[PDB]
């Protein structure tokens, strides 16, 4: 989530 950061990025994924």
Helix, strand, coil percent values for the chain (each to nearest 5): 0, 0, 100
2 Cβ neighbours under 8 A, 6+ residues apart: none
Experimental method: NMR
The two tokens of residue 1 are 């989530």
Task: Name the region of 2 (left: φ>0; alpha: ψ -120 to 50; beta: rest).
Answer: beta
Number of Cβ within a 10 Å radius of residue 4: 3
| Span between the terminal Cα atoms of the chain, in Å | 3
User: Coil, helix or strand for 4?
Assistant: coil
């Amino acid at each position: 989530p950061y990025p994924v």
